[PDB]
Amino acid sequence: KVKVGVNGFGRIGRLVTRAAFNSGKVDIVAINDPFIDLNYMVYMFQYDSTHGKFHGTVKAENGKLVINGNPITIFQERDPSKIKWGDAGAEYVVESTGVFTTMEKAGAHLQGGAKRVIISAPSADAPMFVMGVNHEKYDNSLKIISNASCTTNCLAPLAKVIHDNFGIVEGLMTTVHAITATQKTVDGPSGKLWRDGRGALQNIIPASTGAAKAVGKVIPELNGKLKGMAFRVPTANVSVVDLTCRLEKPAKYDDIKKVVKQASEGPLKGILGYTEHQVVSSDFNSDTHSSTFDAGAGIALNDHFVKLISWYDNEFGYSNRVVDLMAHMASKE
Amino acid sequence: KVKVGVNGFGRIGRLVTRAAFNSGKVDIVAINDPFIDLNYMVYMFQYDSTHGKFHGTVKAENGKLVINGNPITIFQERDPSKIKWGDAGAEYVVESTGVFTTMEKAGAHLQGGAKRVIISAPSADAPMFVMGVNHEKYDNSLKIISNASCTTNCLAPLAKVIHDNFGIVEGLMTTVHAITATQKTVDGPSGKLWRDGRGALQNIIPASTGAAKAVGKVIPELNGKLKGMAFRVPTANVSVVDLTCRLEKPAKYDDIKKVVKQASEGPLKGILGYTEHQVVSSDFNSDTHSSTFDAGAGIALNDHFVKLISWYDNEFGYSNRVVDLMAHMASKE
Amino acid sequence: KVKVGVNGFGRIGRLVTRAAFNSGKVDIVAINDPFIDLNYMVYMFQYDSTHGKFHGTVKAENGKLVINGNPITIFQERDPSKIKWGDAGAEYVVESTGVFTTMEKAGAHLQGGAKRVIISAPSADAPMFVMGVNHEKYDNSLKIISNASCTTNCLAPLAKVIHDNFGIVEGLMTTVHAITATQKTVDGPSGKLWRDGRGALQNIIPASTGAAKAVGKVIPELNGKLKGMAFRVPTANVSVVDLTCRLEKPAKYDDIKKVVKQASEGPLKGILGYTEHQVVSSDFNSDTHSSTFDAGAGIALNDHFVKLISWYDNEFGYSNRVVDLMAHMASKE
Amino acid sequence: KVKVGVNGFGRIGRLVTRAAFNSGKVDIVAINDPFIDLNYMVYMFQYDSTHGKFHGTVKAENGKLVINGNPITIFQERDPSKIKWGDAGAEYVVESTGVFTTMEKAGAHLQGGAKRVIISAPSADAPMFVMGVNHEKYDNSLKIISNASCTTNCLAPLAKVIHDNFGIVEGLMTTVHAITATQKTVDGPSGKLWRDGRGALQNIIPASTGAAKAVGKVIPELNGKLKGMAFRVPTANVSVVDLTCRLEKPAKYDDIKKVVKQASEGPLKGILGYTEHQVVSSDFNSDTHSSTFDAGAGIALNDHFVKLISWYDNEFGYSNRVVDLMAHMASKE
Ligand SMILES: NC(=O)c1ccc[n+]([C@@H]2O[C@H](COP(=O)([O-])OP(=O)(O)OC[C@H]3O[C@@H](n4cnc5c(N)ncnc54)[C@H](O)[C@@H]3O)[C@@H](O)[C@H]2O)c1
Ligand SMILES: NC(=O)c1ccc[n+]([C@@H]2O[C@H](COP(=O)([O-])OP(=O)(O)OC[C@H]3O[C@@H](n4cnc5c(N)ncnc54)[C@H](O)[C@@H]3O)[C@@H](O)[C@H]2O)c1
Ligand SMILES: NC(=O)c1ccc[n+]([C@@H]2O[C@H](COP(=O)([O-])OP(=O)(O)OC[C@H]3O[C@@H](n4cnc5c(N)ncnc54)[C@H](O)[C@@H]3O)[C@@H](O)[C@H]2O)c1
Ligand SMILES: [Zn+2]
Ligand SMILES: [Zn+2]
Numbered sequence A, B, C, D: 001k002v003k004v005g006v007n008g009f010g011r012i013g014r015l016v017t018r019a020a021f022n023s024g025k026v027d028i029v030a031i032n033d034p035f036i037d038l039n040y041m042v043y044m045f046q047y048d049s050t051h052g053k054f055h056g057t058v059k060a061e062n063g064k065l066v067i068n069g070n071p072i073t074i075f076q077e078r079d080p081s082k083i084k085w086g087d088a089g090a091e092y093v094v095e096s097t098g099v100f101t102t103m104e105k106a107g108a109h110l111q112g113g114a115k116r117v118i119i120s121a122p123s124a125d126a127p128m129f130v131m132g133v134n135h136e137k138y139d140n141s142l143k144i145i146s147n148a149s150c151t152t153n154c155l156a157p158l159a160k161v162i163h164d165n166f167g168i169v170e171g172l173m174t175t176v177h178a179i180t181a182t183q184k185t186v187d188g189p190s191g192k193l194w195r196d197g198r199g200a201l202q203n204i205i206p207a208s209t210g211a212a213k214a215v216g217k218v219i220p221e222l223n224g225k226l227k228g229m230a231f232r233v234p235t236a237n238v239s240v241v242d243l244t245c246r247l248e249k250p251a252k253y254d255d256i257k258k259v260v261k262q263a264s265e266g267p268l269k270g271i272l273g274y275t276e277h278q279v280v281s282s283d284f285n286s287d288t289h290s291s292t293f294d295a296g297a298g299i300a301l302n303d304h305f306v307k308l309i310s311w312y313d314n315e316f317g318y319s320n321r322v323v324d325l326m327a328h329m330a331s332k333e
């Protein structure tokens, strides 16, 4: 029902667009990307190495991108403040370029007529929200918000269930993460983050992520109680979280399984998943969950000290959450 | 000085041979592998996808594998007890087939004239040793010993330094593991371990490992205080250990760095490495250390709860330890 | 209508089974595989790293494999002559183990009551058939036949069109081929084919193939006019043929495009594909064509000397052809 | 002996620097790169995912990059005309940024006092040279030249031997090429070349290359008689050429082997290699040859129609040729 503009037609931009048209929860009416012209958008959206060919129709007609018969205005602006979202009827803008993550930078979309902006990444100052965890804390005074990172959306739902039931005194997270567009095919320049410049195909690359720390924002009680890091590895998609945490109340591993499974079947349905199957990463490709608990993979040293494993399609899960978030916001208007 | 025989000419058998000739600490004089004839041995030893072409000469001559002008007797016996080690002058035998890990089976080499047997893998009932950790516990009454696994050799030296200085109350370990020969190119049968059957190129694959528990043996005080698991990922060589542990005594991260660096420069020199460089996995290709502490990659939530990162060439490092162990044994004769 | 048994429930076995339930052209009533028990078959069939989770239902009940409600008898015989195909009602047997490719070896299935056998690979003496090329040469007197290789099924339909219109004087073919189950994850023993033993993730591996020569069997006029080789590269699925040939009659590239596109829409519909899109290998994953001509990728030096490019899902395309051929065989009974 | 400056410290820039110091054929005295400061240069040059840690010393001292005790002046100029090559003592300048490949653009280095410029890539207008083929056609009047491409340097030497002995009537080339810096980790924008934007790890990507056509310039007699294309595949380094050519004079394959081997041991020593071993791509990592003929991989349909295979380290071979070319220029001077 809410009309949506997308800034940055990349992995997230394109898959948010897919999620939108597949679910019908929001309507994409405009897209901006200076480095992808209209004809190129048809090809990039239609064919996808990771998630296969788009199920539906896409073509260019009269300057518009037409997906499933729905025309979309196409902009080619480098400067976000110059995009005429208002003229196109875009009420919400998905900010998914990755270079406008502050409220100041993302707020440029308001000058073009956008009413609200959703940053598809962590923000230094924008309020972050995770569906199933704190999305009800949103209110209509917030015109610029963040949907956090893919990793945060994996960790937070799980952390909520564990904290709600047993309490997390302290925890340390590792994520084995699929490669992304920011990495390099071969050893190349990355002056700010030297390790991230090394060849992505050849290397396990340790990386710093504020994902664990970010969970402290969407779940205030866990503020300062979580830290983590990442290992980037040569897979095209799907990542996994490794949460090692100390519980303040005792819990058998079966108790943990029970409460997680219960959550996945109820209040966190579609967000937090649960499995006992012998899964590997490819089994979660195009899976729309934010987080899927791997029961068989976890290990318990004692009732107070455990390692919990959760899978996530970093591309497809997060993209769907962006749509869910916007659908929820629209319902409050 | 001591003469060595090698049963099995796989990744380990061949790299023990390389380490032996490169370091010159021992002399290979016999090899046994049914599935590999003499001409093929030259090829497999000379050319290596991971560690490159051998530095030195290798050729067949008079039915002998000649490495660096040193002839080596070859055997093709499927039954270990049928190998004439004594005739070829082999004092120590490196059992590296991986199917004779028990005291009974491994002892078969003795029947042939072998004086001592070194198992290059975990054993269910043979005394396990890790250089730098408990190798001084070796005495001359032991005829059949084990050098534990590649991962145990990475974790134990670090675990020793941390335990000796601050005391590990408890710890959970993750290892991001490069692919191995037991895995499959595409989804194939692995009846006992279903996840391991899945395509190695396509998947992050969780897997069980007894490395953390094995540290309990070589370091008795840590018995029952460590366990862990693995994630197999599509990289060719070099793995990494992720140890999340609670400490009883306070330990600022700078104090951890100090004691590990101190250990790397003194008693554990050559075994436990230390670095503050922005390293990735490939930087440890053909690194001979059992384990190299990654200072920049580790994180501390507080003085009692930390995540410690250590790299290892799961092939090269371990193979050299086997040679080092044999050299230590020879010095005790 | 015709009831089918599958020997060897591997990549081709499982995908032949998928193709059969998806097309409905035949009925799978029995499967044999000593190294995959009933419960394991459920897992291997349901989850696929390459082609995704099975669309439909699969489970074990009453000792039967039940797919979409249809019970399937499961055998665990190593000896082909000991499988009770007749009792299970299997009339045709798909021989897809890779180790019974001669008529003598494949004929063992007749002892257990099978009526005809279709070898899912090249055979040294069994008549080879390729859908769209020579399948109409099949007749009821042939009880054991071969569906050739994936590569042959790609090249032959293309070569047919080119020869029919312009005449191939001579040709040389290269196939850039995805990895398969026969390859190794790391340098391992392969005494018969040394290069094939080398790690499949790290290397481009030149390999021999009789695919081009086999086209001379299914297209007799081209006997002795074609030869080729292969490069194995680190991708999980989908391969491509590179055909360099001399033509007898003048052929503008636009004329080649015309006749190939004509064929793809007419008599070779569903077997030979045609595209002008900017495609890469993943765009053909789970594509059912035997061969898809890549218009933009090909090049013409002159009217008589050209390089033609054709893509194929080596797993999925070939598997459907096996089902197609069996349905055709049944039509001739 | 000749002092050299390097513009652009990328894969080629850095590996030309390695080649220079390893061979000692020229002296690097200056380097320019706006996107890599002094400290970062030390790291990027020392550590290399593909060719391992640099064998020697590297450090920053007094604003200089010091390799093996040799100080090197560092510039950070975006505009090549502003680089004081002269003051730094650099006579020749290797232009290896990939964005100054024209004579007008590369000529900017002369304004800074450089005497000659070698473009480490094909040029639209600068004369191209390939060591072993037409380097003797270089003369002192030429201030701005090109060393062509890696692929041209692989194909031309081979083409020379074949054309000289048997005459190439016509030929078509395919190169299976390892990934490069211009490719993307995941589906991303590549506006002028759509296929090159697709994920490099996931895809076999067909691509255009003027390598075969370029051979016609370094070998005038073959002008218009060759063309080709490339398949990009997910390997970090080492590529292979596949030359399918028709010959005017009869040539048994043994005769082809003979003349190629003969050249590898004589005038083309170090440029054109010859092997009959069962090699795979990784065996040529850090191989300094421009082209190594794979005797066992090639095939002949008849005495006039053959497919010849040749390997090349696209990074290391080319870099050493840049140095050889400069050394040759200096010998004339
Ligand atoms: N890929 C993931 O798994 C993932 C998951 C969660 C969040 N994110 C975050 O989403 C954001 C985008 O990530 P991505 O993977 O889609 O990267 P991407 O490179 O695939 O896409 C980003 C793009 O935005 C375009 N762009 C660049 N500058 C622009 C500008 N000034 N104006 C408009 N468009 C511009 C680019 O052409 C490109 O298409 C990042 O912040 C990322 O951290 C990514
Ligand atoms: N993978 C491809 O792309 C492709 C394409 C065309 C043809 N083929 C051919 O099909 C055949 C199988 O190929 P694949 O890729 O499925 O190999 P695969 O290894 O994936 O499966 C073959 C199997 O047969 C089973 N098996 C082994 N011995 C058996 C026995 N005595 N009895 C019953 N089952 C047994 C194995 O358990 C395994 O499941 C081969 O001949 C192959 O050349 C493969
Ligand atoms: N990589 C190969 O295999 C190969 C083989 C043959 C030829 N080449 C050619 O060599 C050239 C470089 O290729 P590459 O593989 O090293 O890619 P690369 O990305 O690694 O190197 C290009 C670089 O030059 C730097 N640079 C960019 N703009 C600059 C500027 N204005 N001034 C100074 N430095 C600048 C960049 O920091 C970067 O290091 C290309 O033209 C390529 O076609 C590459
Ligand atoms: Zn039932
Ligand atoms: Zn028919």
Ligand SMILES: [Zn+2]
Residues within 6 Å of the ligand: D102, D103, D104, D124, D125
């Ligand atoms: Zn010009």
